[PDB]
Amino acid sequence: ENILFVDDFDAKCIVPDTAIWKLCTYANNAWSQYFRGVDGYENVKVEEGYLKLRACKDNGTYKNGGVFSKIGFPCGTRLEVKARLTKLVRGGFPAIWQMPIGAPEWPRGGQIDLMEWVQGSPKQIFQTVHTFYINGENGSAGVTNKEADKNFDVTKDHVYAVQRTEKELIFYVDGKETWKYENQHLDKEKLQYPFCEYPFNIILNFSLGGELNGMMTWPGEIHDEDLPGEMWVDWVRVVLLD
Numbered sequence: 124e125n126i127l128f129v130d131d132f133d134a135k136c137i138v139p140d141t142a143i144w145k146l147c148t149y150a151n152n153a154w155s156q157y158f159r160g161v162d163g164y165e166n167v168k169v170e171e172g173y174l175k176l177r178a179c180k181d182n183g184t185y186k187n188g189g190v191f192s193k194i195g196f197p198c199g200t201r202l203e204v205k206a207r208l209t210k211l212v213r214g215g216f217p218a219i220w221q222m223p224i225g226a227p228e229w230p231r232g233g234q235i236d237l238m239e240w241v242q243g244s245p246k247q248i249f250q251t252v253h254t255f256y257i258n259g260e261n262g263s264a265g266v267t268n269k270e271a272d273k274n275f276d277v278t279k280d281h282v283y284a285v286q287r288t289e290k291e292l293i294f295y296v297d298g299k300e301t302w303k304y305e306n307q308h309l310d311k312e313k314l315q316y317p318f319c320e321y322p323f324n325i326i327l328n329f330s331l332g333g334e335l336n337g338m339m340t341w342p343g344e345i346h347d348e349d350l351p352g353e354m355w356v357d358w359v360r361v362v363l364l365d
């Protein structure tokens with residue numbers, strides 16, 4: 124099987140590979156708002172074969188932990204990520220996902236979420252597709268997998284995967300297919316399937332929710348007493364398909 128990229132996070136270093144992995148930065152949205160004033164690698168380390176991403180509160184200030192790949196991947200590929208949460212955190216918002224590189228403004232270039240967790244459904248994860256066709260100017264939910272295992276322990280290791288081709292996206296958990304999002308071969312102007320127009324990166328983060336500009340976010344209310352939380356990523360792999 125053809126390995127286009129792999130990181131086992133087992134390099135003789137205390138931070139993830141500095142050529143591949145960049146620290147996440149502040150932006151006025153739910154997942155990014157608490158990268159503000161995160162000092163370098165304070166919430167991000169490599170240790171005992173894991174990337175360890177921490178979310179915590181530091182003298183009044185919520186701080187996220189996350190990195191994104193500077194490298195990205197074409198179509199005809201499958202991304203596999205092994206990860207667990209150390210615990211459930213109320214208001215915690217950990218994610219394993221992909222953004223297009225150099226695409227028009229979100230959500231026009233698309234977005235793929237291999238894993239998200241929120242306190243509102245604590246014994247499940249979400250696998251989600253975003254496009255301008257789905258979301259338009261006003262939508263943020265995307266299309267998510269409704270038959271998601273309802274009886275599932277996020278604090279154990281799982282392998283989250285998406286296979287991306289011109290035909291479709293196929294999601295997996297622990298090597299079992301969960302759902303697919305098909306190319307409908309519509310007018311290019313509808314932007315229904317942008318997933319081969321730009322390379323997609325890898326994003327790994329443990330973010331905190333609560334209010335954004337006075338509106339409650341999907342991950343809901345932050346319970347300070349539950350903090351800190353960590354996501355441990357054992358490995359990331361991108362395979363070239365047949």
Ligand SMILES: CC(=O)N[C@H]1[C@H](O[C@@H]2[C@@H](O)[C@H](O)O[C@H](CO)[C@@H]2O)O[C@H](CO)[C@@H](O[C@@H]2O[C@H](CO)[C@H](O)[C@H](O)[C@H]2O)[C@@H]1O
Nearest residue numbers: 150151152153154216217218220222229234236239253263
């Ligand atoms: C509604 C929203 O917050 N959208 C931002 C998007 O969010 C992701 C969600 O769509 C989804 O729930 O999965 C992940 C993991 O939890 C994120 O929460 O993220 C993108 C990429 O960061 C944002 O696009 C960026 O917006 C900023 C300004 O806010 C900037 O314009 C940048 O150019 C753009 O890429 C969505 O706003």
Ligand SMILES: [Ca+2]
Nearest residue numbers: 131132172357
């Ligand atoms: Ca590892």
Ligand code: NA
Nearest residue numbers: 139140141144
């Ligand atoms: Na790095």
Ligand code: NA
Nearest residue numbers: 236249250251
């Ligand atoms: Na999701």
